[PDB]
Design a protein around this ligand. Structure first.
Ligand SMILES: CCCCCCCCCCCCCCCCCC(=O)OC[C@H](COP(=O)([O-])OCC[N+](C)(C)C)OC(=O)CCCCCCCCCCCCCCCCC
Ligand SMILES: CCCCCCCCCCCCCCCCCC(=O)OC[C@H](COP(=O)([O-])OCC[N+](C)(C)C)OC(=O)CCCCCCCCCCCCCCCCC
Ligand SMILES: CCCCCCCCCCCCCCCCCC(=O)OC[C@H](COP(=O)([O-])OCC[N+](C)(C)C)OC(=O)CCCCCCCCCCCCCCCCC
Ligand SMILES: CCCCCCCCCCCCCCCCCC(=O)OC[C@H](COP(=O)([O-])OCC[N+](C)(C)C)OC(=O)CCCCCCCCCCCCCCCCC
Ligand SMILES: CCCCCCCCCCCCCCCCCC(=O)OC[C@H](COP(=O)([O-])OCC[N+](C)(C)C)OC(=O)CCCCCCCCCCCCCCCCC
Ligand SMILES: CCCCCCCCCCCCO[C@@H]1O[C@@H](CO)[C@H](O[C@@H]2O[C@@H](CO)[C@@H](O)[C@@H](O)[C@H]2O)[C@@H](O)[C@H]1O
Ligand SMILES: CCCCCCCCCCCCO[C@@H]1O[C@@H](CO)[C@H](O[C@@H]2O[C@@H](CO)[C@@H](O)[C@@H](O)[C@H]2O)[C@@H](O)[C@H]1O
Ligand SMILES: CCCCCCCCCCCCO[C@@H]1O[C@@H](CO)[C@H](O[C@@H]2O[C@@H](CO)[C@@H](O)[C@@H](O)[C@H]2O)[C@@H](O)[C@H]1O
Ligand SMILES: CCCCCCCCCCCCO[C@@H]1O[C@@H](CO)[C@H](O[C@@H]2O[C@@H](CO)[C@@H](O)[C@@H](O)[C@H]2O)[C@@H](O)[C@H]1O
Ligand SMILES: CCCCCCCCCCCCO[C@@H]1O[C@@H](CO)[C@H](O[C@@H]2O[C@@H](CO)[C@@H](O)[C@@H](O)[C@H]2O)[C@@H](O)[C@H]1O
Ligand SMILES: CCCCCCCCCCCCO[C@@H]1O[C@@H](CO)[C@H](O[C@@H]2O[C@@H](CO)[C@@H](O)[C@@H](O)[C@H]2O)[C@@H](O)[C@H]1O
Lengths: 311, 311, 311, 311, 311
């Protein structure tokens, strides 16, 4: 057992395919997902030719250790995948059809910029390293790339599973390495974020603005500080579900901005009271009357500007 | 070792059964459960027959590696199942009886629409892929489907464990695949949700409505905002136990609706105060007097409407 | 290797012992615990007998695979136990003494009715399934059931480790199965629940009742609603440590009842205020005067009733 | 392969050492720690002795399965340790030197009485069970007990790693068992508890006592109940990092005591107000004036008593 | 199979390289990180030398078990690494080129002093232990130390991966041990700490200082105590992400200092009110007027001092 030798001096082509049976645990924080799939491998090995006549059988079945099998590995996994050889078929010419079922935890960065209205392309990268007597090179048999209909990934919509057909070939520590990019295209179901986070967060903000219709300092201070706190809670909640990014995310921004609104609300509440104590309620009155319009208007304007920047 | 060949040209029939020994860890968020069970397999292998009278043994026992065993796999598992072969028996006509004990973690989607008053059908899907010299096909021996009496799944009632007797047969990458649907029917015990979540949540809401019997703005603001905060707490608690769905859930909806009630209460409290400061207590008085009835009534109507839409 | 055949036509008796070396991770929520222990098996295999004299040896040693060993399994485990065969001895008349050291995660339901003053019986169930040429049956050699003195199980007191001597024998898929019940009797150390949960929870309740000595609506509302929120916190704390049961638990009931106290307190606070605004302080005064005694008395009466019902 | 037989009728002596390479994950709640270490074993096997002059070689090598090796096991682990045999040397007189590198998770109870100013003695117990043809007995080769200089265990100082030289020998199920006690002496770095928990907790308490310089019931009620809540938070935080003990811990006590202070502060705030409403401000005034001194003094005295009881 | 013997009496040099394919899970609390990489080993074994001419190949392939391979291990890992041998090549003069792909969890202490503006040096320590017939010694082939371009470690910037070329050699239990230090230089992306923790924390503090423009005790008590509570929440949040250190961290220090601010704020609020009740508003007035400037100024001075001490 060692690689099949060249008729001319060509590289050995290994045809690959991945067929997804299960998708689970897309973990936003860790940036990983779990996959369970068929991996198929095919390649010519002429040493394996045989006569159906002189051997009885149209196809031969072999056990893994009886024949050379190319060492395909995944790049972006945590551990070597878990693999069960399902079947090895050789047709008389010596074409080998290899089928395994595997499960793995795959590393794959997400772009959180438009969370929770984002989409992602997950990758599974197949690789192979050339041996000394010859160069091995990968290809996609499109016939054998797919996914079953039930493959659901909680909280995500699956758009498509396809491979980039042309391998990236490169040198790595003095041997040739041939790498393939399988892509799984998903988009986040943002639905639930609406009732669970966004609206509650808006409600509490609007409740704060009722301070603009009140001349009670002690009341206002309570309205504004209390809701501020609830906002902090949502902030903390939302940030425990995301990893820490070196860029602002869309929700992140809305969340941050809204602090500014609480801060300016407190100022207004403070100024209004101060003026009142100093015996000038009319200036106060018209600062408050303004705020009733200004706050919602600037809040709306600022949001449109953000949606534009982000989307 | 390779498949037993056809007398005529029929498929090979593998009879299967699953007998549950343990059920644990129905995890709502992950949408998985753990199972520990007997898997039974039976099929005819004529190469293995013998004389009942001549042999003087009724039956005969082999070690897994000595005979052909069909590769049965689970579709919706995380990893290949953990299996000990318990026993393999071959009788005179060459019928093999195979028995393993296995544990696995099974993926199976839940419908959270009626949570926490919901029911589910868990699935375990057995599958086999045909080989080159013949097609393998699955069937259910009902005699060998079941579950022991103590199988308790915490926080759920077990209704039934049955198999859909007719396999789904289909082609997958150019070979026939035979698949069976075992169903575990369960329903959630909603009991504890009542004292732990629902009632507390109502109590704090009703406490909010005491503001309708109070002319103190500062008091009301404290009543209404305080309880709203406790409501957010229950909301966050509830939503950490569920996964994120693209559809409202029953509890989800009640929770969301109740925000609307707090918001409107705050408005009323604001309006009442405003009119009082503006020297018109009698309009204020009759808005509050209306609210004493309107709030409980519309809360009751809205709930009946919801239970009707959901159930 | 296959089962030793009957002298007459008797079943094969396997004597068993379990000797606990470690107990850890009694997890209330999952209802499981971890064990590490010796498992000892003994049975007669006549094919293995020998003359003491032409051998010059009292005993003989074997490696697992060299002789027939009965397949004992645990019923109520997650996965097949982890086992090291420590030693196998065969004495002249062919009595085999088998000793293994194993660890396993055991499933075992708890009765949370009297938490945290509760006791439990943990079970480890040994089983064996009969083969075709004979019936195997389990027994307990009391000599070899025990636990070492240091076996401590955090937060629990260990009462006793004993086996029910008589197996339950029954049929399961057309073979006889012999099952033994080892029982580990424990009771919860309730001590810490007192200063960590119970008393705090009482202190905040009592603090609430100070509203009965205050004519300040604003003050009272603060007292009552504040402490109610702390109560919710302890409620949430407590319920994250327990699984969800279809029955009320003792702590659960105290917790729930207390909500009723807060609710009625808020009513009283409300009524008192209302009457005062409506210029009748004397009715108010005697409702409050009553409450100072009613609340603590009815609280004490309701608790005695509950302890009675639960204990 | 079976045990080397006695020259006279002596027991076989296995010399042992443990050399720590890594210490991590001292988990207070689980009462476990993880260790990575060399385990060294030495014993005389005469069947293996050879000549140095004629052999030309002065030491001989072996693979594990080629010679008898005593089965040493750890008592207080979760699972059998993970072990790579590093090397096995045999010298001319047939002395074997065995070396393995292992990792394990070790169970070892902690005394939380003085937390977080506490010290602990972790234990790793080695054990061996005698075989039928002779008794095996353990000893410590001090030359081979130690730890590397970088062995750091987060949040703990390492004082010393020594073995108690004399084994405990005892019978267990009719065989002799020899057991050795390796001790790892550590003490907790309490530093960070000071700024993270203790001081904040004192700060909020002191803030509570400002009520004693205030004649505002509403203000006071807010001061006291608010801080009491923050106190509960620190309580809950602290108790999630400890396991539940059947004894008071030092911090636990301070934490519990402090509730008593809040409760009495609330009473005082209540009494003061009551007297004021009832038109007697001078009794009120001198109760408060007393409390300004009493509170801090009794708090200081109570703490000295506790430190004394605990330390 | 055993070590290749010296031409003269030289040590055997093993050349090593590590080439990172993946970095993930830098966990601050556990002080560990996960790595996935090529490890390459090279050394001369003359027994394996061969004539290019007579044998008709310029390279020679072996399976691990067929030749001697030095036992290289990592020092600071949790468990033995997970390794596939990728390839073993022997050239004519008997130079062996070994290549494995491995994954491991590496322990490596972090200096938290400047968190979250900190940088770290992660280490992977390769080691080998000499055998009896000769001394093995490690070196770095710089040709073979590297990392691929996509190696991203979430929330960290990767500066460089280099090896200190000169081994530390030392004796351990009477054998020579040769150890190499591969260093991975990273610095934390502090960006998101700004909007998520730092600014919110400053906002709530500034809100507190509005109390300095308010003569309402009851209001002030609410501002200062509310925000103090929010600060405790940020404190708790921050400290659950960090392990417990025996030194103050930068954030740690800001956070602690800020408590001092709240406490002094409360005192001011208290004194102001006291003086007012005692009929001297003018002292009060000028204490508050001072505080409006003192607080922000001393806050700013104290921060410059801190940055200076820490950076
Ligand atoms: C107020 C604060 C929160 C509001 C944020 C909602 C912004 C959604 C707009 C968006 O970019 O989504 C586009 C897409 C996903 O992004 P996309 O990639 O399909 O957008 C295409 C970008 N251009 C314009 C260049 C082609 O999502 C949708 O299908 C729209 C539905 C969103 C409904 C918003 C619900 C908010 C209700 C809260 C009140
Ligand atoms: C609340 C503020 C509504 C203002 C109505 C008004 O101006 O009335 C004039 C006055 C004069 O007359 C009325 O009687 C109006 C009574 C209607 C008030 C009831 C409001 C609550 C409805 C519950 C909805 C719950 C949401 C889910
Ligand atoms: C508060 C209790 C009521 C005071 C009783 C009274 O009427 O005093 C008479 C009046 C007149 O005289 C006094 O001086 C009473 C001062 C008592 C102060 C009590 C505070 C005790 C602080 C210890 C807390 C420790 C917790 C453990
Ligand atoms: C402590 C006692 C101080 C009470 C104030 C007073 O009595 O004022 C006298 C009066 C008269 O004079 C003043 O103007 C004093 C101004 C007081 C403001 C002090 C705030 C400094 C903030 C420091 C916190 C962080 C530390 C690091
Ligand atoms: C940073 C953001 C700063 C926001 C402050 C904006 C003030 C807007 C004033 C509005 C106004 O002038 O109208 C009538 C004004 C002016 O009224 P007036 O003109 O009739 O009387 C003023 C009289 N004296 C001389 C005593 C001031 O009314 C007020 O004065 C209201 C006071 C509001 C105070 C809000 C203070 C915020 C406290 C936080 C400090 C933040 C700095 C921290 C940074 C340092 C960190 C190292
Ligand atoms: C004034 C102060 C107010 C402070 C309020 C702060 C509220 C704190 C809420 C945090 C709740 C923590 O739990 C929140 O929900 C569940 C469900 O996804 C998750 O719990 C579990 O842990 C992680 C795993 O790393 C998650 O990825 C998640 O899938 C789940 O398995 C958390 O990641 C967190 O998102
Ligand atoms: C003002 C805002 C305040 C709002 C704060 C909301 C408080 C949120 C508290 C979260 C509760 C902690 O944990 C919540 O409860 C239980 C459910 O029975 C689960 O807690 C369990 O703890 C352990 C096991 O004991 C983990 O294995 C965890 O994954 C989960 O099974 C979580 O999945 C989560 O849903
Ligand atoms: C309106 C006010 C709302 C306030 C509500 C506040 C509720 C706060 C929730 C309490 C948080 C405790 O949640 C948890 O309790 C138990 C049981 O799971 C935990 O005990 C352990 O926690 C972690 C590890 O330490 C998990 O592995 C868990 O399975 C358990 O072993 C505590 O460590 C704590 O993390
Ligand atoms: C109105 C009242 C509000 C009260 C609110 C109380 C807030 C309580 C917040 C607690 C947050 C969780 O607290 C922290 O969480 C994690 C951090 O990974 C820990 O979980 C883990 O527990 C064990 C092992 O499982 C330890 O090894 C620990 O270091 C940690 O890794 C907890 O034991 C605790 O350290
Ligand atoms: C994985 C574990 C997750 C951890 C979850 C733990 C989160 C705990 C959240 C803390 C609850 C906040 O508790 C908060 O205390 C103070 C601050 O207002 C309040 O107590 C309050 O006294 C005053 C002064 O504040 C007012 O605001 C008034 O509203 C009253 O309720 C409450 O309004 C409440 O909002
Ligand atoms: C007035 C009192 C207010 C007190 C409020 C205190 C609230 C504290 C809330 C903190 C909740 C825990 O904080 C965050 O939540 C969890 C939930 O998956 C996240 O999940 C995990 O926890 C930590 C620590 O175990 C890491 O292992 C991290 O990599 C992540 O996997 C972390 O980001 C955690 O830091």
């Amino acid at each position: 057992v060692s690689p099949p030798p060249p008729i001319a001096d060509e590289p050995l082509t290994v045809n690959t395919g991945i067929y997804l049976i299960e998708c689970y645990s897309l973990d936003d924080k860790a940036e990983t997902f779990k996959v369970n799939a068929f991996l198929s491998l095919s390649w010519k090995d002429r040493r394996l030719a045989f006569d159906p006549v002189r051997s009885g059988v149209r196809v031969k079945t072999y056990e893994p250790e009886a024949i050379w099998i190319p060492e395909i590995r995944f790049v972006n996994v945590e551990n070597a995948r878990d693999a069960d050889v399902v079947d090895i078929s050789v047709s008389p010419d010596g074409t080998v059809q290899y089928l395994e079922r595997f499960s793995a935890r795959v590393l794959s960065p997400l772009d959180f910029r438009r969370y929770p209205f984002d989409s992602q392309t997950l990758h599974i990268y197949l690789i192979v390293r050339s041996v000394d007597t010859r160069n091995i090179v990968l290809a996609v048999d499109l016939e054998k790339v797919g996914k079953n209909d039930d493959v659901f990934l909680t909280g995500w919509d699956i758009e498509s599973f396809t491979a980039v057909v042309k391998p990236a070939n490169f040198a790595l520590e003095d041997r040739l390495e041939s790498k393939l990019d399988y892509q799984l295209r998903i988009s986040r179901q943002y639905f639930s974020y609406i009732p669970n986070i966004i609206l509650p967060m808006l409600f509490i903000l609007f409740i704060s603005w009722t301070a603009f219709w009140s001349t009670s300092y002690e009341a206002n201070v309570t309205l504004v500080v209390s809701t501020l706190i609830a906002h902090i809670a949502f902030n903390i909640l939302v940030e425990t579900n995301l990893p820490k990014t070196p860029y602002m995310t869309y929700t992140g921004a809305i969340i941050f901005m809204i602090y500014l609104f609480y801060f300016v609300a407190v100022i207004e509440v403070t100024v209004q009271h101060y003026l009142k104590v100093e015996s000038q309620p009319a200036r106060a009155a018209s600062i408050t009357r303004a705020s009733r319009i200004a706050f919602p208007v600037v809040f709306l304007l600022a949001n449109i500007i953000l949606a534009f920047l982000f989307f």
